[PDB]
Amino acid sequence: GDVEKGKKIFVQKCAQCHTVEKGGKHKTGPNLHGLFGRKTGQAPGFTYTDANKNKGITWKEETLMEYLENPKKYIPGTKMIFAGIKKKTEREDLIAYLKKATNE
Ligand code: HEC
């Protein structure tokens, strides 16, 4: 995935509700730092829905791929308001960008 394109998608579609830096603030959504290989509902300091918490999955490329295409389908009852990125290549670019950013 194109990490630069992925960063722009993040800035346009996710930054309104999320930070990704270590020690970044919760906004509407939880800070995403350390996302990859973490279970749902794990960011310290954030009020998650039970639906998010009870999903049981680990965030990684495959589960983010499916999640971000249609969040309400993946986690019925999630309070994340987002229709989804329907284009596979835009998801791959975004996720390639998140894999770097949330890790650093
Ligand atoms: C506000 C209108 C948001 C937009 C736009 C985006 N996100 Fe979101 N995110 C938001 C909330 C309120 C929540 C918690 C939902 C709940 O049911 O508690 C989330 C959660 C996530 C998660 C789960 C994080 C976890 O620790 O389990 C992920 C992986 C995530 N969000 C990603 C994400 C991406 C990549 C976005 C842009 C495409 C995006 N969100 C937009 C709020 C909002």
Swiss-Prot record:
Q: Which residues carry this modification: Phosphotyrosine?
A: Y48, Y97
Question: Which SUPFAM superfamilies does this entry report, sorted A to Z?
Answer: Cytochrome c
A Pfam family this chain is assigned to: Cytochrom_C
Residues bearing N-acetylglycine?
G1
Keywords, in A-Z order: Acetylation, Apoptosis, Electron transport, Heme, Iron, Metal-binding, Mitochondrion, Phosphoprotein, Respiratory chain, Transport
Query: Which of this chain's residues are annotated to bind heme c?
Result: C14, C17, H18, M80
Using the record's annotations, give every residue carrying the modification N6-acetyllysine. K72, K99
PTM field: Binds 1 heme c group covalently per subunit. Phosphorylation at Tyr-48 and Tyr-97 both reduce by half the turnover in the reaction with cytochrome c oxidase, down-regulating mitochondrial respiration.
Per its record, what are the GO molecular function terms?
A: electron transfer activity; heme binding; identical protein binding; lipid binding; metal ion binding
Q: PROSITE patterns of this UniProt entry?
A: CYTC
Q: Which domain of life is it from?
A: Eukaryota
Q: Which residues carry this modification: N6-succinyllysine?
A: K55, K72
Q: Keyword Nucleotidyltransferase: yes or no?
A: no
An annotated GO cellular component of this protein is:
mitochondrial intermembrane space
One example of a Gene Ontology biological process annotation: cytochrome c-heme linkage
Q: Where in the cell is it found?
A: Mitochondrion intermembrane space
Q: Can you tell me which family this protein belongs to? A: Belongs to the cytochrome c family.
Q: What does this protein do?
A: Electron carrier protein. The oxidized form of the cytochrome c heme group can accept an electron from the heme group of the cytochrome c1 subunit of cytochrome reductase. Cytochrome c then transfers this electron to the cytochrome oxidase complex, the final protein carrier in the mitochondrial electron-transport chain. Plays a role in apoptosis. Suppression of the anti-apoptotic members or activation of the pro-apoptotic members of the Bcl-2 family leads to altered mitochondrial membrane permeability resulting in release of cytochrome c into the cytosol. Binding of cytochrome c to Apaf-1 triggers the activation of caspase-9, which then accelerates apoptosis by activating other caspases.
Q: What else is known?
A: Mules and hinnies are heterozygous, having equal amount of horse and donkey cytochromes c.
Instruction: Identify this protein by name.
Output: Cytochrome c
Naturally occurring in which organism (per UniProt): Equus caballus (Horse)
The gene that this protein is the product of is CYCS
